[PDB]
Design an enzyme around this catalytic site. Structure first.
Site, mmCIF file in Angstrom:
data_model
loop_
_atom_site.group_PDB
_atom_site.id
_atom_site.type_symbol
_atom_site.label_atom_id
_atom_site.label_comp_id
_atom_site.label_asym_id
_atom_site.label_seq_id
_atom_site.Cartn_x
_atom_site.Cartn_y
_atom_site.Cartn_z
ATOM 1 N N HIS D 112 0.805 -1.215 0.000
ATOM 2 C CA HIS D 112 0.000 0.000 0.000
ATOM 3 C C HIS D 112 0.842 1.271 0.000
ATOM 4 O O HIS D 112 0.284 2.367 0.122
ATOM 5 C CB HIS D 112 -0.957 0.013 1.197
ATOM 6 C CG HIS D 112 -1.854 -1.182 1.263
ATOM 7 N ND1 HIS D 112 -3.117 -1.196 0.712
ATOM 8 C CD2 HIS D 112 -1.662 -2.412 1.796
ATOM 9 C CE1 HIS D 112 -3.669 -2.378 0.918
ATOM 10 N NE2 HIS D 112 -2.806 -3.135 1.568
HETATM 11 C C1 HEC Z 1 -5.969 -10.461 -9.576
HETATM 12 C C2 HEC Z 1 -5.836 -9.184 -10.434
HETATM 13 C C3 HEC Z 1 -7.307 -10.450 -8.804
HETATM 14 C C4 HEC Z 1 -8.529 -10.643 -9.311
HETATM 15 C C5 HEC Z 1 -8.832 -11.358 -10.646
HETATM 16 C C6 HEC Z 1 -9.445 -10.647 -8.191
HETATM 17 N N1 HEC Z 1 -8.782 -10.152 -7.086
HETATM 18 FE FE1 HEC Z 1 -9.590 -9.616 -5.296
HETATM 19 N N2 HEC Z 1 -7.755 -8.989 -4.610
HETATM 20 C C7 HEC Z 1 -6.578 -9.055 -5.349
HETATM 21 C C8 HEC Z 1 -5.500 -8.509 -4.561
HETATM 22 C C9 HEC Z 1 -4.018 -8.382 -4.973
HETATM 23 C C10 HEC Z 1 -6.142 -8.098 -3.234
HETATM 24 C C11 HEC Z 1 -5.462 -7.446 -2.019
HETATM 25 C C12 HEC Z 1 -5.226 -5.990 -2.384
HETATM 26 C C13 HEC Z 1 -5.222 -5.130 -1.155
HETATM 27 O O1 HEC Z 1 -5.132 -3.891 -1.323
HETATM 28 O O2 HEC Z 1 -5.314 -5.672 -0.026
HETATM 29 C C14 HEC Z 1 -7.540 -8.426 -3.358
HETATM 30 C C15 HEC Z 1 -8.483 -8.211 -2.379
HETATM 31 C C16 HEC Z 1 -9.813 -8.551 -2.439
HETATM 32 C C17 HEC Z 1 -10.745 -8.541 -1.332
HETATM 33 C C18 HEC Z 1 -10.403 -8.157 0.123
HETATM 34 C C19 HEC Z 1 -10.745 -6.701 0.410
HETATM 35 C C20 HEC Z 1 -10.367 -6.401 1.835
HETATM 36 O O3 HEC Z 1 -10.929 -5.443 2.420
HETATM 37 O O4 HEC Z 1 -9.495 -7.116 2.388
HETATM 38 C C21 HEC Z 1 -11.934 -8.935 -1.790
HETATM 39 C C22 HEC Z 1 -13.236 -9.083 -0.973
HETATM 40 C C23 HEC Z 1 -11.799 -9.203 -3.203
HETATM 41 N N3 HEC Z 1 -10.492 -8.958 -3.568
HETATM 42 C C24 HEC Z 1 -12.801 -9.628 -4.040
HETATM 43 C C25 HEC Z 1 -12.620 -10.135 -5.304
HETATM 44 C C26 HEC Z 1 -13.642 -10.761 -6.109
HETATM 45 C C27 HEC Z 1 -15.100 -10.982 -5.648
HETATM 46 C C28 HEC Z 1 -13.082 -11.130 -7.266
HETATM 47 C C29 HEC Z 1 -13.749 -11.837 -8.465
HETATM 48 C C30 HEC Z 1 -14.603 -10.842 -9.279
HETATM 49 C C31 HEC Z 1 -11.695 -10.727 -7.241
HETATM 50 N N4 HEC Z 1 -11.443 -10.124 -6.026
HETATM 51 C C32 HEC Z 1 -10.788 -10.925 -8.255
HETATM 52 C C33 HEC Z 1 -6.445 -9.554 -6.623
HETATM 53 C C34 HEC Z 1 -7.457 -10.011 -7.434
HETATM 54 S S1 FES Z 2 2.073 -0.228 3.205
HETATM 55 FE FE1 FES Z 2 0.300 -1.382 3.799
HETATM 56 S S2 FES Z 2 1.093 -3.391 4.231
HETATM 57 FE FE2 FES Z 2 2.877 -2.128 3.963
#
Ligand code: HEC
Ligand code: FES
Ligand SMILES: CCCCCCCCCCCCCCCCCC(=O)OC[C@H](COP(=O)([O-])OCC(O)COP(=O)([O-])OC[C@@H](COC(=O)CCCCCCCCCCCCCCCCC)OC(=O)CCCCCCCCCCCCCCCCC)OC(=O)CCCCCCCCCCCCCCCCC
Ligand SMILES: CCCCCCCCCCCCCCCCCC(=O)OC[C@H](COP(=O)([O-])OCC(O)COP(=O)([O-])OC[C@@H](COC(=O)CCCCCCCCCCCCCCCCC)OC(=O)CCCCCCCCCCCCCCCCC)OC(=O)CCCCCCCCCCCCCCCCC
Ligand SMILES: CCCCCCCCCCCCCCCCCC(=O)OC[C@H](COP(=O)(O)OCCN)OC(=O)CCCCCCCCCCCCCCCCC
Ligand SMILES: CCCCCCCCCCCCCCCCCC(=O)OC[C@H](COP(=O)(O)OCCN)OC(=O)CCCCCCCCCCCCCCCCC
Ligand SMILES: CCCCCCCCCCCCCCCCCC(=O)OC[C@H](COP(=O)(O)OCCN)OC(=O)CCCCCCCCCCCCCCCCC
Ligand code: HEC
Ligand code: HEM
Ligand code: HEM
Ligand code: HEM
Ligand code: HEM
Lengths: 80, 380, 241, 147, 380, 144
Positions: D112
């Site tokens: 982040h």
């Molecule tokens: C690869 C590009 C991904 C795709 C395809 C999907 N997600 Fe994802 N997701 C990805 C990352 C690298 C992260 C973490 C990023 C961060 O800033 O923490 C996430 C996170 C989520 C979360 C969690 C949110 C939270 O508050 O912790 C959710 C609920 C989520 N992603 C949902 C989601 C869904 C429903 C997807 C299918 C449409 C999906 N993601 C695809 C990477 C990737």
């Molecule tokens: S800046 Fe958020 S996990 Fe390190």
């Protein structure tokens, strides 16, 4: 309900005792312990010992019978 | 003022059950053994608690956790082998306690005797599941054999065995639920032992002469307090010379291998205190017959108070029934020896004759002998 | 054949009731395992830090651990990597899984020798008799490839080739490495590997025997004090007639 | 006897031999070159160690104590300013900082975007606090004992 | 002769405790609550036993075993959520039981009150380690926080915390020994409840008027039998609607993530029944002072019988102390709210004033109010 | 788990057979690929979380088995996160690999917007708008 005071009705019985600090803890321990142990073992040895004697005989016979059961019979491989 | 020992409602029970309890003055060292059993129970519980802080009830990690206890926990080998040899000491003291009850006519305390045989069943179940717990080769195959012969009950047996297993065989669910049950049953054993003490304390203890000892009773403290302390010290001497000098003379070597479902051992045994029952279980060429033979071989102690046909309670003045009793102890030792032997000649016929003699001495020979003994004293 | 041959009793230096292990023999047997037995057999529950204070010092065991390579990870790219070993590392596997051991040993599985004198009848006597008991098979019985006659092995057809002969390794202390000496050293090492608490257990047992020899007559004397107040009690019946 | 029994059971409840083996680290030594930080594993956490130059020492010491988000100078973070030792976990979501990145020339988290300086201080980013420094011990200069 | 209910030694204990026990006729529904506690304890034990049949206390598989219980075991989700919501129901019933004892002057039964305080300590410790057991994020971080506050003790605290941990932090050994202790403590709680009932039946029970109810007493059966069955059925209504309709209104969402030592949560709280103690500890800007504040809060709850300076027992005829009591209950609600809030303005000053008012109401204001009431009623 | 909820036995068996999973060891101790079965779990995209962090620009995509129960708001949070990608306001500087999402804590998520209009084709002919796809996947995550 069942404590000291209401266990049994005893009349005309006198008991004498002395302090444990007044008497020895081992009064003639060996010289009267040996004949008493000999008397007890000669009153109970004929009731106790012969069952365990025949257990020893049955155990030895069973072990040796199993050992000759694993032994090769020389009567086999005699015709040819 | 006020005597606090006889008035405080928690100290009053402790007083009435251990200090001012009127006990017979002439009870021998055999009467120590039950107190030893209680001590052994506490010892087992304490050692069991210190096994539970490192044991994992997972089939991938149970053997690894046991080896980690023996090798990496400080004095963990000491607590583990104290637990195993304390189970063996528990069964030694249990057998001698039951033999005291049979010899001196203490089964006429019928409620105490029935709570006892319930305690005996609970202790055997606890020890069986505890022996399953380390998940060795021998543990897995002993559990498999015992449950497979438990499947002999018609129309419910396969369903009951698959319900106990939680699956098609002995697996992870079986080990985890056996850990839970082996944890929880010694506390039920402690509660049943409290009921056992209450049912004894309604009427006092028996004496080796078998007579009414109301004329000669002494307080429990300090006489039987120091006698029980001496018996505790001797039992601890035997337990620590079993642990610190010969730690594997009573166990099986094949339990030090991991549990292989593919590999079966050449000879399958339970631990030694089950062995005689195992011999009885294989003295009949029928599965239901062997199962009921084992169940009635334990329950014949419960049947024992209805077989007393003598006018004398104890066997101190009864020599023919003394001879029959020592023959019973003799073929109990014989059945213990047969139970550890493989099923060939002449162990089959010796075990069959030993089981027949065991049931005939308990069922038939002792009441007939008691009738004859009453006839000799011009009583019958 | 279903008939079995029991190994005899050997006069081990730890056979006695208070007799500990000879630690030079454990060091030599660890060398025997490292140079010969480690190619096929595993020691999953023994680490290098267990050797400290028994056979080797801290730096010697550290050098012994860093001689080998241990798989470790994951890295920051998520990939496995080899690293030099350390004291907390366990002894290295010969094979990654038992099926590789089956493939490499003609269908036979060389067992893990961490409890091998605890899991066999005879103990170290059985191991010594198995290692020094390879001989020609008698007449009437024949064996195939991958099999070797051993009268102490059950079934007398072991899948292990005889691993020990005269001068199969060189000792650090200049001891002549005959077959009997190497087998005795590795049996002592395997006895230590199954029972690492052995000397501490026997020292505890010696202290226990001394304490019980002190405490049993004293507790007996206290009991006989508190009971000899009763055991000399005299009774008298005095009816009024 | 009661002393020995109670003491043995209490010592059984204490830390085992494998936990005591994993607590102390192998010798970090002086393998660290000039400017580069390297990472080891310690208690399931990354551990960064780095050689530090005097210009960077004065640049980190120019920043005051009470004016930051958390009051901590450069002088009480390390005992000897030649080396810096810290736990390499970003304290926002538990990621790993990137070695030699960010505007301050220290560490940067790719998760982040938290900027870290050479002292492990947070200055720009959503990280709620700093990167913690373990309590180490200084033997003779070939060996430093952390853990 | 055939009055077995009062001649059988087992049956006379159940008779004397539940059938022919003289109870006050006028006790309200509040007197149900302790009986509910016993039933709730049994429920916990039963659910825990089945939860012990599939749970592994290994840090690599504890969360996996919890998910396997909730997904693959038949009605395993029901057993787990009944266990969690039954812990919440147990603490609700504890709070109402303690509040009844505070309001109606039941603390003058001093031995019963002290055994209760020990029971409350044991139940809080059991629930804390049980919440550590599922090995989520919040379990690990709450265990770490609480053990650090234990490490605030000078000169012995750090060694004691590394002894309780079994290492350097919360880890494998901590989780396994917490499973062992969480198994074993409810049976000690049951034994202490037996001691609780023993002391109360020694002294008799109180009524809402606080008067001697010997003139009007009724048998426990069937009046309070059917009244406590109605209370058990109402409690099961609330427990089952909490399980089957709102399973997560009392739990925390971050426990549904696996434990990560690298990631810390933005706000760490315990469960709701520890929040008032967390707010009491967190208000004082010191570590040892806060730990002493928590311990002495439960200890002045224990110390309550020594602060009674009134000639009347219950608060039924004491309106000023009634007002102070409801202000105290209101303050406990405020402290429970503050314990779930982070440390920003104005939560620090609200929690500080709440804790100060709590200790001032318990220690100072209530005996002064009782003295004022004794003046106003012209007693002296 | 999909049998009797969303798919039939043969439908879930075809779904399992269309992916290839890890099996082993064989008789010579070598890992090998096999067609999937009904008892097989859903396949991991990465073997270890460090590989996931390396592939996803440091960030770790969490396991979405309890992501409804491990987030405040439940499926409302997931629906607001998936449909709530917007341009950042003035005064907010955003690095590479990060995307503005006001429903994410910190308003800087490492996940690119994964769904749009016609992002897939439904089997039942439902039009695949962004809101419909987000609602469907939020319902599936609530079931999971
Ligand atoms: C690869 C590009 C991904 C795709 C395809 C999907 N997600 Fe994802 N997701 C990805 C990352 C690298 C992260 C973490 C990023 C961060 O800033 O923490 C996430 C996170 C989520 C979360 C969690 C949110 C939270 O508050 O912790 C959710 C609920 C989520 N992603 C949902 C989601 C869904 C429903 C997807 C299918 C449409 C999906 N993601 C695809 C990477 C990737
Ligand atoms: S800046 Fe958020 S996990 Fe390190
Ligand atoms: C033989 C040579 C010595 C001798 O003549 O001794 C006489 C003496 C008997 O003398 P006596 O006057 O005829 O009898 C009165 C007793 O002395 C009165 O004492 P007692 O025998 O009633 O003592 C109570 C009993 C208490 O015994 C127990 O509590 C035993 C508990 C059960 C055994 C342990 C459990 C596990 C069992 C596993 C199998 O203790 C014993 O039986 C002996 C205790 C010895 C302690 C160690 C001494 C060194 O013999 C013994 O005491 C035998 C043991 C010692 C030798
Ligand atoms: C306007 C407001 C309602 C007025 C009204 O209906 O008045 C009738 C009536 C007026 O009562 P009353 O005739 O003046 O005297 C009460 C009776 O002598 C005796 O009645 P009682 O209320 O003392 O009955 C025994 C008591 C026994 O209470 C219990 O067993 C409950 C024990 C506590 C359970 C707590 C569970 C956990 C709570 C966590 C928070 O039961 C209750 O308190 C409620 C029973 C409800 C049964 C199901 C009704 C549908 O109201 C009630 O009886 C109250 C319950 C109404 C439902
Ligand atoms: C071993 C030595 C036993 C022994 O010495 O037995 C004889 C002894 C005599 O005692 P008693 O007949 O009471 O007379 C006292 C002297 N006039 O008699 C006794 O000491 C009586 C011993 C009674 C308890 C013996 C228990 C032996 C083990 C039984 C195991 C199996 C029990 C049943 C299981 C089903
Ligand atoms: C509950 C009952 C538990 C078991 C009771 C007997 C335990 C005996 C035992 O294992 O003792 C071990 C202890 C060895 O002492 P050690 O570890 O060498 O250290 C002494 C000071 N350095 O040995 C001793 O301290 C001496 C032996 C005492 C035996 C018990 C006497 C009563
Ligand atoms: C609770 C909500 C309010 C209930 C209510 O209406 O209470 C009034 C009731 C009046 O009862 P009383 O004064 O006896 O008058 C009877 C004459 N008709 O008064 C009562 O019922 C008083 C008893 C209430 C007991 C429970 C309330 C307090 C619960 C929390 C206590 C926390 C104690 C400390 C715990 C941490 C340490
Ligand atoms: C590869 C050629 C090996 C060498 C080097 C060592 N061992 Fe071995 N061992 C090997 C196999 C394939 C087997 C199993 C053979 C079978 O038929 O089961 C074994 C077995 C053993 C055993 C177990 C004997 C038993 O009764 O189960 C022992 C105790 C043993 N081997 C000892 C041993 C020692 C001490 C070694 C170092 C000198 C050693 N082996 C080396 C294969 C190989
Ligand atoms: C509630 C108290 C108890 C607990 C918590 C407990 C716990 C355990 C645990 C964790 C093990 C596995 C560790 C090991 O392999 O030794 C075990 C083994 C065992 N337990 Fe217990 N146990 C208790 C009481 C008992 C009792 C009363 C008996 C006797 C009937 C008993 C008999 C055994 C046996 C025979 C083993 C196998 C020992 C072996 O590996 O050889 N346990 N127990
Ligand atoms: C769980 C193990 C057991 C414990 C802890 C236990 C405990 C006790 C205790 C403390 C006593 C009183 C002291 C004594 O007389 O020895 C006693 C006596 C007795 N027990 Fe047990 N017991 C157990 C097993 C049994 C069993 C299995 C039986 C039934 C065969 C039994 C039947 C009796 C009898 C009949 C007595 C009376 C002794 C007499 O007056 O002669 N007990 N037991
Ligand atoms: C001896 C009986 C008990 C056993 C065997 C037992 C066992 C367990 C087990 C295995 C768990 C983990 C499964 C899970 O997370 O739901 C657990 C959780 C828990 N237990 Fe117990 N327990 C017992 C009694 C109690 C009691 C009396 C309480 C207090 C009222 C309690 C409070 C808890 C709590 C709060 C949790 C955490 C629930 C969660 O977050 O999922 N347990 N217990
Ligand atoms: C472990 C949970 C508890 C259980 C199972 C329990 C059990 C009981 C039972 C069955 C009663 C008799 C019925 C009744 O009057 O409600 C009772 C009454 C009582 N309990 Fe508890 N109790 C518990 C916790 C406590 C605590 C924590 C205290 C101390 C604050 C306490 C103090 C009392 C008092 C003073 C009474 C007498 C009530 C009166 O006569 O007014 N109990 N308890």
């Amino acid at each position: 309900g069942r404590e000291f005071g209401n266990l049994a009705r005893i009349r005309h019985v006198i008991s004498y005792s002395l302090s444990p600090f007044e008497q020895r803890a081992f009064p003639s321990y060996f010289s009267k312990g040996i004949p008493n142990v000999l008397r007890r073992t000669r009153e109970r040895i004929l009731r106790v010992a012969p069952p365990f004697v025949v257990v020893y005989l049955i155990y030895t016979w069973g072990n040796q019978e199993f050992e000759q059961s694993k032994r090769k019979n020389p009567a086999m491989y005699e015709n040819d | 003022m006020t005597n606090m020992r006889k008035t405080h409602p928690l100290f009053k029970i402790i007083n009435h059950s251990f200090i001012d309890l009127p006990a017979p003055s002439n009870i021998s060292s055999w009467w120590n053994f039950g107190s030893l059993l209680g001590v052994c129970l506490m010892v087992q519980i304490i050692t069991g608690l210190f096994l539970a802080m490192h044991y994992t009830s997972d089939t991938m990690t149970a053997f690894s956790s046991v080896t980690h206890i023996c090798r990496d926990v400080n004095y963990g080998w000491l607590i583990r082998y104290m637990h195993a040899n304390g189970a063996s000491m528990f069964f030694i003291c249990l057998f001698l306690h039951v033999g005291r009850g049979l010899y001196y006519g203490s089964y006429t305390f019928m409620e105490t005797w029935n709570i006892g045989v319930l305690l005996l069943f609970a202790v055997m179940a606890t020890a069986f599941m505890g022996y399953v717990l380390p998940w060795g080769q021998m543990s897995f195959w002993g559990a498999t054999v015992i449950t497979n012969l438990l499947s002999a009950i018609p129309y419910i047996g396969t369903t009951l065995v698959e319900w106990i297993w939680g699956g098609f065989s002995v697996d992870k669910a079986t080990l985890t639920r056996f850990f839970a049950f082996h944890f929880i049953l010694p506390f039920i054993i402690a509660a049943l032992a409290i009921v056992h003490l209450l049912f004894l304390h309604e009427t006092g203890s028996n004496n080796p002469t078998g007579l009414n000892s109301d004329a000669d009773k002494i307080p429990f403290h300090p006489y039987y307090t120091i006698k029980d302390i001496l018996g505790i010290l001797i039992m601890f001497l035997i337990l620590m010379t079993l642990v610190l000098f010969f730690p594997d003379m009573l166990g099986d070597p094949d339990n030090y291998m991991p549990a292989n479902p593919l590999n079966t051992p050449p000879h399958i045994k339970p631990e030694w205190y089950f062995l005689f029952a195992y011999a009885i279980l294989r003295s009949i060429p029928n599965k239901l017959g062997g199962v009921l033979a084992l169940i009635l071989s334990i329950l014949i102690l419960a049947l024992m108070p209805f077989l007393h046909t003598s006018k004398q309670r104890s066997l101190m003045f009864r020599p023919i029934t003394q001879i029959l009793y020592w023959i019973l102890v003799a073929n109990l030792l014989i059945l213990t020896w047969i139970g550890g032997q493989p099923v060939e000649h002449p162990f089959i016929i010796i075990g069959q004759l030993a089981s027949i003699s065991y049931f005939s001495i308990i069922l038939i020979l002792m009441p007939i002998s008691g009738i004859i003994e009453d006839k000799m004293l011009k009583l019958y | 054949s279903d008939l079995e041959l029991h190994p005899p009793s050997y006069p081990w230096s730890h056979r006695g009731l208070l007799s500990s292990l000879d630690h030079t023999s454990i060091r030599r047997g660890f060398q025997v395992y490292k140079q010969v037995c480690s190619s096929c057999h595993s020691m999953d529950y023994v680490a290098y830090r267990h050797l400290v204070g028994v056979c080797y010092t801290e730096e010697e065991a550290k050098a012994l651990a860093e001689e080998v390579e241990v798989q470790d990870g994951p890295n920051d790219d998520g990939e496995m990597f080899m690293r030099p070993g350390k004291l907390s590392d366990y002894f290295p596997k010969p094979y990654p899984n038992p099926e590789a051991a089956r493939a490499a040993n003609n269908g036979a599985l060389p067992p893990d020798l961490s409890y091998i004198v605890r899991a066999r009848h005879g103990g170290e006597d059985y191991v010594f008799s198995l290692l020094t008991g390879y001989c020609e098979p008698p007449t009437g019985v024949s064996l195939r490839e991958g099999l070797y006659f051993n009268p102490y092995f059950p079934g007398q057809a072991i899948g292990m080739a005889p691993p020990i002969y005269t001068e199969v390794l060189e000792y650090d202390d200049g001891t002549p490495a005959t077959m009997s000496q190497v087998a005795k050293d590795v049996a002592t090492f395997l006895r230590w590997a199954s029972e690492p608490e052995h000397d501490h257990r026997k020292r505890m047992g010696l202290k226990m025997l001394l304490m019980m020899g002190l405490l049993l007559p004293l507790t007996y004397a206290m009991k006989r004090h508190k009971w000899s107040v009763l055991k000399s009690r005299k009774l008298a019946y005095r009816p009024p007639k | 006897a009661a002393k020995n029994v109670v003491s043995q059971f209490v010592s059984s409840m204490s830390a085992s031999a494998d936990v005591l083996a994993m607590s102390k680290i192998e010798i970090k030594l002086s393998d660290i070159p000039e400017g580069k930080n390297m990472a080891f594993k310690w208690r399931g956490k990354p551990l960064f160690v780095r050689h530090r130059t005097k210009k960077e020492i004065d640049q980190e010491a120019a920043v005051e104590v009470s004016q930051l988000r958390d009051p901590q100078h450069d002088l009480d973070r390390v005992k000897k300013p030649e080396w810096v030792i810290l736990i390499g976990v970003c304290t926002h979501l538990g990621c790993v900082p990137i070695a030699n990145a960010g505007d301050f020339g220290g560490y940067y988290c790719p998760c982040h975007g938290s900027h870290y300086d050479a002292s492990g201080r947070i200055r720009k980013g959503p990280a709620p606090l700093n990167l913690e420094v373990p309590a180490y011990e200084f033997t003779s200069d070939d060996v430093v004992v952390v853990g």
